[PDB]
Amino acid sequence: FMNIQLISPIDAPILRQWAEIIHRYWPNPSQIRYGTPNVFGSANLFTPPEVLLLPIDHQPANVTTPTLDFTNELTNWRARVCELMKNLVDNQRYQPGW
Amino acid sequence: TTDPCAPVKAFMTLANMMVGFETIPMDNQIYTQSRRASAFSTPHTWPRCFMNIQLISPIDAPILRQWAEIIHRYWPNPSQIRYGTPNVFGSANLFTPP
Amino acid sequence: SFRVALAGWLYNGVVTTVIDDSSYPKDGGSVTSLENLWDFFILALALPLTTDPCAPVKAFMTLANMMVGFETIPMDNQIYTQSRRASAFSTPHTWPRCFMNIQLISPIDAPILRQWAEIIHRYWPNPSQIRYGTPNVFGSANLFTPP
Amino acid sequence: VALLSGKYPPDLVTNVWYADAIYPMYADTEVFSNLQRDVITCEAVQTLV
Amino acid sequence: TVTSPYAPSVNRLMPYRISNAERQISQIIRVMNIGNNATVIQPVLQDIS
Amino acid sequence: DEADDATKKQAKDTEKAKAQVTYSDTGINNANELSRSGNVDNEGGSNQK
Amino acid sequence: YVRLDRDRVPTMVGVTRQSRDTITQPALSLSTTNTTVGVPLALDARAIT
Amino acid sequence: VAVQLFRPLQGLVFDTQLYGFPGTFSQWEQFMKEKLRVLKYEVLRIYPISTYNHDRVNVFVANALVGAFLSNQAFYDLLPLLIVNDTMISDLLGTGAALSQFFQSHGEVLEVAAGRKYLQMNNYSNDDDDPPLFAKDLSDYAKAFYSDTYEVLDRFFWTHD
Numbered sequence: 001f002m003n004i005q006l007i008s009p010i011d012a013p014i015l016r017q018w019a020e021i022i023h024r025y026w027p028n029p030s031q032i033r034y035g036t037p038n039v040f041g042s043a044n045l046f047t048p049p050e051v052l053l054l055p056i057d058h059q060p061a062n063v064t065t066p067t068l069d070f071t072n073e074l075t076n077w078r079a080r081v082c083e084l085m086k087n088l089v090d091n092q093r094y095q096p097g098w
Numbered sequence: 099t100t101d102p103c104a105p106v107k108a109f110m111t112l113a114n115m116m117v118g119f120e121t122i123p124m125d126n127q128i129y130t131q132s133r134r135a136s137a138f139s140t141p142h143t144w145p146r147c148f149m150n151i152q153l154i155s156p157i158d159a160p161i162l163r164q165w166a167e168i169i170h171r172y173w174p175n176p177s178q179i180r181y182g183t184p185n186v187f188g189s190a191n192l193f194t195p196p
Numbered sequence: 197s198f199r200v201a202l203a204g205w206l207y208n209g210v211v212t213t214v215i216d217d218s219s220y221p222k223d224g225g226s227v228t229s230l231e232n233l234w235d236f237f238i239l240a241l242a243l244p245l246t247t248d249p250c251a252p253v254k255a256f257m258t259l260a261n262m263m264v265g266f267e268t269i270p271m272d273n274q275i276y277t278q279s280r281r282a283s284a285f286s287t288p289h290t291w292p293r294c295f296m297n298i299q300l301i302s303p304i305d306a307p308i309l310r311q312w313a314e315i316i317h318r319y320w321p322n323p324s325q326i327r328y329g330t331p332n333v334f335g336s337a338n339l340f341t342p343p
Numbered sequence: 344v345a346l347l348s349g350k351y352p353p354d355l356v357t358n359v360w361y362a363d364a365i366y367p368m369y370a371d372t373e374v375f376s377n378l379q380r381d382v383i384t385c386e387a388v389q390t391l392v
Numbered sequence: 393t394v395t396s397p398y399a400p401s402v403n404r405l406m407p408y409r410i411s412n413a414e415r416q417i418s419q420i421i422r423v424m425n426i427g428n429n430a431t432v433i434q435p436v437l438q439d440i441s
Numbered sequence: 442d443e444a445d446d447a448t449k450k451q452a453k454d455t456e457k458a459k460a461q462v463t464y465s466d467t468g469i470n471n472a473n474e475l476s477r478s479g480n481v482d483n484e485g486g487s488n489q490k
Numbered sequence: 491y492v493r494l495d496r497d498r499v500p501t502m503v504g505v506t507r508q509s510r511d512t513i514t515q516p517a518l519s520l521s522t523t524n525t526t527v528g529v530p531l532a533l534d535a536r537a538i539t
Numbered sequence: 540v541a542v543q544l545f546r547p548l549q550g551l552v553f554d555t556q557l558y559g560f561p562g563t564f565s566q567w568e569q570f571m572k573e574k575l576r577v578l579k580y581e582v583l584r585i586y587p588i589s590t591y592n593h594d595r596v597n598v599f600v601a602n603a604l605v606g607a608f609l610s611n612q613a614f615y616d617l618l619p620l621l622i623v624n625d626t627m628i629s630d631l632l633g634t635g636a637a638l639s640q641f642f643q644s645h646g647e648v649l650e651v652a653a654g655r656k657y658l659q660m661n662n663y664s665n666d667d668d669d670p671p672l673f674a675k676d677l678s679d680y681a682k683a684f685y686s687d688t689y690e691v692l693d694r695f696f697w698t699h700d
Contacts, residue, residue, distance in 0.1 A: 068132040076554060152577050155574075296496070
């Protein structure tokens with residue numbers, strides 16, 4: 001899993017694609033800068049004052065009338081999972097079984 | 099319908115169905131490929147993609163390009179017909195010739 | 197309310213007439229709502245008849261509040277934000293520098309707010325004065341004012 | 344299920360929605376009350392030492 | 393948004409503001425109480441939920 | 442209290458239960474305004490007795 | 491009255507008892523405790539319009 | 540196996556699947572040539588060259604416009620901001636005209652995402668003699684915080700992790 005090249009691209013193609021997807025399209029952190037340190041203190045430790053950390057990325061909304069879009073990281077994740085499953089279901093070693 | 103925005107509302111009606119299947123560039127963030135098709139009722143809201151047909155890429159999104167071409171080509175053409183008589187009744191119509 | 201508006205002009209020095217909060221848009225408001233648009237219209241036509249030191253600031257800042265998320269204006273400090281209620285602008289020390297100087301409002305990012313600010317700075321009613329009573333035989337109880 | 348199913352109100356604006364939802368919670372005093380408890384704890388530890 | 397008066401005032405006593413070392417010490421003590429119990433930390437997650 | 446009393450009496454003057462002109466609950470924050478009462482004497486003390 | 495000249499907008503009104511050639515305890519009159527110039531009064535924008 | 544992107548083409552911040560590049564150098568070259576030729580005519584239409592010839596161009600706005608058009612995402616808003624009035628950071632601060640993925644406003648410092656410098660084709664197989672891409676072929680390798688003064692940047696990074 002650490003070194004993707006160990007997985008053979010000709011014997012484990014689908015699992016190789018899964019590992020590549022994990023490495024490329026996994027969520028990445030961000031920060032949001034909460035609170036005020038003037039009146040209240042900075043009770044956070046191991047981190048700079050006045051900040052969170054998030055498991056996923058953050059892009060502030062530019063408009064106040066939200067409407068649907070698919071230009072999203074957690075949507076790309078789902079799309080990649082769906083494409084991986086499609087590749088799984090159309091495979092010469094697995095297609096004729098259905 | 100006599101609404102002067104039916105040509106753009108038809109294109110937006112098709113575009114809103116396949117959101118994420120094919121995407122086209124659409125002006126501001128507020129009026130987007132997912133914005134309700136009935137909100138395009140004014141000339142200022144006509145997308146530049148619908149104005150200049152070349153903006154729709156015919157590789158990833160051929161269906162939208164073909165639909166825009168069909169709208170631009172096969173939309174009905176206005177005409178006229180003579181009516182009434184001005185000899186005794188007179189012509190009460192205005193902004194148009196009698 | 198209309199008659200007390202005229203009555204308070206004489207007694208500005210001890211009582212100042214302002215507009216109640218309920219007359220403003222209910223929840224800050226937005227220009228996407230017809231009710232909020234009509235509330236702003238009523239506010240705009242009702243504000244000038246008040247003996248409030250800062251009426252134009254409230255008048256401009258109401259539209260600035262409603263138009264959050266559609267067009268922005270430069271702010272002087274990070275403590276405040278465009279989306280702050282116009283009822284809090286009751287003191288001269290809270291006049292935004294963008295409202296003071298129109299040149300800071302960028303026309304590309306605020307075509308409507310710049311026009312509203314220009315309208316307020318141009319067509320706000322000018323104060324005046326009128327001669328009343330008789331000073332020679334009745335004297336005058338006028339202070340901070342010629343008798 | 345939460346990821347695959349989720350919808351907004353038919354037409355909402357975030358500024359008004361949050362100006363309505365957050366206002367009730369910003370009228371209490373618990374946050375200001377906990378700081379005095381923190382002071383007393385930090386005083387008592389040093390007094391004990 | 394909140395509002396504050398702008399006028400001469402009668403003096404008031406509000407000792408709420410504290411430093412950062414006291415906050416850090418209190419946070420350390422709160423982490424201490426939690427330990428590995430896991431029955432103390434469930435209610436707070438419920439509360440934020 | 443006297444501001445609220447004047448607000449009440451304005452409604453009686455105007456014949457309607459509710460009031461349009463209100464001397465209370467206006468938007469302006471006046472937490473510093475003071476009126477003369479019997480709580481304080483002439484020298485800055487308190488008239489408890 | 492001033493329209494937009496913020497540099498000359500009135501903000502306080504007070505009454506003093508002492509002569510100008512003396513220094514004593516500063517006893518501000520109660521008229522200075524209002525955020526505005528005087529007592530706040532509320533109207534109805536709907537009624538005015 | 541790979542190409543290097545210069546000034547106008549910088550700013551591709553999304554995944555390569557969204558762009559849908561052909562994957563072959565000749566086909567990719569023709570496709571990009573056609574796309575830029577299409578975009579140039581719109582840029583001409585809004586800004587004629589007879590009038591605007593020596594006016595300076597916001598490189599941030601140019602990169603954002605190119606990336607938005609190639610990603611089919613709301614390019615028309617950035618076009619009024621193409622010309623520079625006073626300064627790049629000053630003109631780009633507080634606008635909110637484009638997506639927050641391209642550039643963002645944090646007080647008086649401007650944070651601009653860094654686009655891909657290298658782009659690899661299908662022939663890239665991590666070979667022994669393949670060019671080193673230096674991890675610049677990914678969408679989120681680095682972020683740039685632009686400001687006029689270094690002291691303001693230090694003050695900003697005091698709180699930022």
